[PDB]
Design a protein around this ligand. Structure first.
Ligand SMILES: *C/C=C(C)/C=C/C=C(C)/C=C/C1=C(C)CCCC1(C)C
Length: 137
């Protein structure tokens, strides 16, 4: 597999519903949904070490991890968490998250490379799955 690339979003589903679960009020939900239409992902993969840069028009953030080794990032709504990524198959990985402080919904994410050259990202909070699809730039 090689997730490496510059990915641009073509589709985003259930993002507002995910943010609702996470407690975001309606006006900021709509504003966040609009910002997601400029969501871009840059990935550099070497073996099972990943460097990922998530960006929108006004914000950018870097996630660095190795499969099977705990690291710290933040949940979608911004709370700090501890994460662990594992492979599910040749071209799909899953991340489980645990809040560093307090309680909240159970969150996770996945990344998948399809046979058609798309990148599929999902983000989950409890019952609600947001799916976002990307192509290479
Ligand atoms: C492997 C990919 C990961 C861990 C992606 C993480 C992406 C996010 C936490 C995205 C968050 C967003 C918002 C909270 C509002 C603006 C739109 C997004 C999708 C960039």
């Amino acid at each position: 597999p090689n997730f490496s690339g510059n990915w641009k979003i073509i589709r985003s589903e259930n993002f507002e519903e995910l943010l609702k679960v996470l407690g975001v009020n309606v006006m900021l939900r709509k504003i966040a949904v609009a910002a997601a239409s400029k969501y871009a992902v840059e990935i550099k993969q070497e073996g099972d070490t990943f460097y990922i840069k998530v960006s929108t028009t006004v914000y950018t953030t870097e996630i660095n991890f190795k499969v099977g080794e705990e690291f710290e990032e933040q949940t979608v709504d911004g709370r700090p968490c501890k994460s662990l990524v594992k492979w599910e198959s040749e071209n799909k990985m899953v991340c489980e998250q645990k809040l560093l402080k307090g309680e909240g919904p159970k969150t996770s994410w996945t990344k998948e490379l399809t046979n058609d050259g798309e990148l599929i990202e999902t983000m989950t909070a409890d019952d609600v799955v947001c799916t976002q699809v990307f192509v290479r730039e």
